Each structure stands twice: as C-alpha cells, then as structure tokens.
C-alpha cells in the first residue's frame, strides 16, 4: 500500500589516486530505477528499470546535469570536512547523503527526509517538520549555521513535499506492473541434524516483494529472539527477496517450535509447524 522514493549518494576520496569516486542510485520502494557512476565511461544518468526507459531526452539530460552538480558539491565537501575535523591526506574518507519522501496507500505525502553522514556516522539531518536541523557534533553545527543562513531547509521542504511526491506518483503509475505488485512469500521450514542430539530448524521465505517481512520462532508460544539467527533480507536478482531464520534445538522437541511469517502479500500471517 504505502510507497517511497529515495536517492542515495556516496563519495569516497582516494588521496593521490585522482578525484573522488561518486555513485548515485535512486529507488522507488525496493526497486532501483537510475544510477550514475563517476568512473564510468558514459557520464550520464542511466536507466536501471524497464519502466523509466520511456522518459525522453529532456529527462535524461536534466537528471545528468543535476547528478553532476551533486557530484561536484560532494567533491568539495570531502575537502571541507577534512578541514572541519583537522584530518590529513593519509586516508580515504566517505560522505553519504540520502533523501526522499514517503506516501501512504492513498499516495498522499506522509513525510520527507534528508540525511548526511561522514565516515559512516550521522552528520546533519532535516528534522521531521522539514524546517530545522539535527547536527550530530560540533563540526555539523558549523554546517547547520551555514545552511540556516542560506535557507536550505525551505528549498528542501519545497522539493520533498512537492516535486518528490509528484514524480513518485508518476513512477508508480508508469511502473505499475512492477511497483504496485505484491508477491507473497513462498514459505517452508527445513530440518537437519547437527549431532545425535540437536537439529537446526530453518524457516524460509522466498520470492516475495516488497522486501519488508518478519520471521520469528516461538517455543510453546514464547518468542526465541535471543536464540534465533536471522539473516539480512537478500535479493534473488529477479526483483524479489529471500530471508531465513534459524534455531538449534534438542532433537525430539521439534513440535514445540513454530515459525511465524508476516508480509503484506499474505491474507493472514502464517504459522508453520512440525506437526
């Protein structure tokens, strides 16, 4: 029902080996649709979903111009942040920016976000109201003062509440077959002895979309959170996702254990049993 559009930007310095590497990707929900890579030959924003290919030359020229301007600002940022933190040229550093907007089932704006990180830690982010900033440390207060004096939040709010939402709706319509689907998980559990007295129980969810899902184990109805190994949801490569959860249990106790799967494509949450 609910949807999101997000753009992700990463710039990495490589001291003594040229200009920083810059990569940008855009997603609608869990489906990537565009990319730009500074090291690639084309120097264009490029399509990565079939439904965005129909956008005309004005779109690709405009997105390429904007993504290059993003690349140039993040390039400058790497130098600026080295100054703010009194760092040398001995090492590589990373800047990340992500922004975008969420809508509900009725495609009306829920909230917007714009967040920046330096060396893998929060640096500065727009607050939920889109009118003020959260700065994580003293160096980010400097950026906050500069961005308040330049009225950055007013410009971002306008984009996030207006333009971002309008284009998300356009993409949801044009890419409806891909984007407005739900593929319910195909589920099962597997059982393998690890010794003569213990077995691994693994609960599987395959071929689902969107990626959000919950898998949990219970023993006599009690959650087994601390004893569960839960892997990161992973792409199958075809537009759907996979995930599993496992527990190691004493042999003979299998019937006490149940796996529980929740996903938006299921009419009801599933309970899988060994009896």
């Amino acid at each position: 029902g609910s949807h999101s559009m997000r753009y992700f930007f990463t710039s990495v310095s490589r001291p003594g080996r040229g200009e920083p590497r810059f990569i940008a990707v855009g997603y609608v929900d869990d489906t990537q649709f565009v990319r730009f890579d500074s090291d690639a030959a084309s120097q264009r924003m490029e399509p990565r979903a079939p439904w965005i290919e129909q956008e005309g030359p004005e779109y690709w020229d405009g997105e390429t111009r904007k993504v290059k301007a993003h690349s140039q600002t993040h390039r400058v940022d790497l130098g600026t942040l080295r100054g703010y933190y009194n760092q040398s040229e001995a090492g590589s550093h990373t800047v990340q920016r992500m922004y975008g907007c969420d809508v509900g089932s009725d495609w009306r704006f829920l909230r917007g976000y714009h967040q920046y990180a330096y060396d893998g830690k929060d640096y500065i982010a727009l607050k939920e109201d889109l009118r003020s900033w959260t700065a994580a440390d003293m160096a980010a207060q400097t950026t906050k003062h500069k961005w308040e004096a330049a009225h950055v939040a007013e410009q971002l709010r306008a984009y996030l509440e207006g333009t971002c939402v309008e284009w998300l709706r356009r993409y949801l319509e044009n890419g409806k077959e891909t984007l407005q689907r739900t593929d319910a998980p195909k589920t099962h559990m597997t059982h393998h002895a690890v010794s003569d007295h213990e077995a691994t129980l693994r609960c599987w969810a395959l071929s689902f979309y969107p990626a959000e899902i919950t898998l949990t184990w219970q023993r006599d109805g009690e959650d087994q959170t601390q004893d569960t190994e839960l892997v990161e949801t992973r792409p199958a490569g075809d537009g759907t996702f996979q995930k599993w959860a496992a527990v190691v249990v004493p042999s003979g106790q299998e019937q006490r254990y149940t796996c529980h799967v929740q996903h938006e494509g299921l009419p009801k949450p599933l309970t899988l049993r060994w009896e």
């Binding site: 855009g26 993504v67 940022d77 922004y99 330049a150 410009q155 971002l156 984009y159 971002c164």
Partner: peptide, 9 residues
Amino acid sequence: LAGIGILTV
C-alpha cells in the same frame, strides 16, 4: 533529484 537545496557543507 533535487535541483535546489543541495549545498556544500
């Protein structure tokens, strides 16, 4: 992408 509001830190 945003065409405004993306500034240097």
